[PDB]
Design a protein around this ligand. Structure first.
Ligand SMILES: Cc1cc2nc3c(=O)[nH]c(=O)nc-3n(C[C@H](O)[C@H](O)[C@H](O)COP(=O)(O)O)c2cc1C
Ligand SMILES: O=Cc1ccc(O)cc1
Ligand SMILES: [Mg+2]
Length: 399
């Protein structure tokens, strides 16, 4: 069924359809497909699903010039924690990723691998079985109730990373970046948002360390910036991007309740622009809008109207991607794109609408999404969403 009770508006006359250059890529529009974990990866091996992945990315790369950010990809086994999420550390995975990247490039679109490390969001028992640690910034603060519950059951206490163990994660990031780029990826997006490892260090609630990785704005941000510095020196600054969620509360992050959250991120943004002048300007900065502080709550819930991301624009002067409930609000996108360096990320509706860009340009009805197949091990709810034409033939509008 099409989304009922929604007035679609054509966005063909806005900047959403004026090309832009992000890195080495020349996009033909600014509707970006943000990272979306679907959990179809194969176990054992965290292998990209061999039966359905290529088709999935291929469907959503039909509109030429589209920029696609792959689903979260584990840089290594320790950075992992979910049986069905893909990784980019083994030869057996890179062989799969290549087929996807080629399928994507052939449609004339672009792909960026999102580097993922779970921190305290990983399953402790899944880590105990394979003989891995349950990492995080600290060891006296746990994500929640059932996480500290699984920690004990598996006799796998939450571990406060040591300086040498952080250095290791930085070595795996580089390797993963290198594998992805070697397999033909256009670039990689450092995932430093939604309460994962790097965000756990960034947030003052999950980071109560005393060494140079906690204790102040400058220290809580050290990890993220070292990773940025490392990937910039290894594959080029035009092939790297950083994702942040200043006001997110997902996974026990502080959000706007922490008075120093704006300063924490203003700092990071400041360090980027700094490097930008030094010649090394990241390809872009990706921001999750306070319009969505929790990606698990329906469109309109968990909105934080006490803060804004606009401050980033006074510090960083490169491309900025903004994502969060923009598909059902064309009126807000029309205003946000009047800025010449802003890109719009459409998550949940790029899941259900494979031809989303066309529907945005022509103001057509959007396919409602099925939340139940977001993480199912099936093709249903993954690759069987119809395009507008297919929907008409199937009679989704009622004669
Ligand atoms: C099913 C699902 C999977 C997601 N997977 C990821 C992910 O792997 N990495 C990430 O950074 N964000 C992820 N997100 C968050 C989205 O990138 C996005 O910020 C969020 O969905 C808000 O956009 P939307 O309102 O257009 O869906 C996911 C969201 C959903 C609903
Ligand atoms: O729903 C899965 C998910 C994964 C990573 C994120 O960052 C956010 C959501
Ligand atoms: Mg008909």
């Amino acid at each position: 069924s099409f989304v009922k009770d929604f007035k679609p508006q054509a966005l063909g006359d806005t900047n959403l359809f004026k090309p832009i250059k992000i890195g080495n890529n020349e996009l033909l529009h600014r509707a970006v497909i943000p990272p979306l974990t679907r959990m179809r990866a194969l176990h054992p091996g965290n292998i990209p699903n061999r039966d359905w992945a290529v088709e999935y990315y291929t469907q959503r790369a039909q509109r030429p010039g589209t920029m696609i950010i792959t689903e979260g990809a584990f840089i290594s086994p320790q950075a992992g924690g979910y049986d069905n999420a893909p990784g980019v550390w083994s030869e057996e995975q890179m062989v799969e990723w290549t087929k996807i990247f080629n399928a994507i490039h052939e449609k004339k679109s672009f792909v960026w691998v999102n580097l993922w490390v779970l921190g305290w969001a990983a399953f402790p028992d899944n880590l105990a079985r394979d003989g891995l640690r349950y990492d995080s910034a600290s060891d006296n603060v746990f994500m929640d109730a059932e996480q500290e519950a699984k920690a004990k059951k598996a006799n796998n206490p939450q571990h406060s990373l040591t300086k040498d163990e952080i250095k290791q994660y930085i070595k795996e990031y580089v390797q993963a970046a290198k594998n992805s780029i070697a397999a033909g990826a256009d670039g990689v997006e450092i995932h430093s948002a939604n309460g994962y490892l790097l965000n756990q260090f960034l947030d003052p609630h999950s980071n109560t360390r005393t060494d140079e990785y906690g204790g102040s704005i400058e220290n809580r941000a050290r990890f993220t910036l070292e990773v940025v510095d490392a990937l910039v020196e290894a594959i080029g600054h035009e092939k790297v991007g950083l994702r942040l969620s200043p006001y997110g509360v997902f996974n026990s992050m502080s959000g706007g309740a922490e008075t120093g959250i704006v300063a924490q991120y203003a700092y990071v943004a400041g360090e980027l622009e700094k490097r930008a002048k030094a010649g090394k300007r990241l390809a872009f900065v990706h921001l999750v809008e306070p319009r969505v502080t929790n990606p698990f709550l329906t469109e309109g819930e968990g909105e934080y109207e006490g803060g804004s991301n606009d401050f980033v624009y006074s510090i960083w002067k490169g491309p900025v991607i903004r994502a969060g409930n923009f598909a059902l609000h064309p009126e807000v996108v029309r205003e946000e794109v009047k800025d010449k360096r802003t890109l719009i990320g459409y998550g949940r509706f790029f899941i259900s609408n494979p031809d989303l860009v066309d529907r945005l340009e022509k103001g057509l009805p959007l396919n409602k999404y099925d939340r139940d197949t977001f993480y199912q091990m099936s093709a249903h709810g993954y690759i069987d969403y119809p395009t507008y034409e297919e929907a008409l033939k199937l009679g989704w509008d009622k004669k």
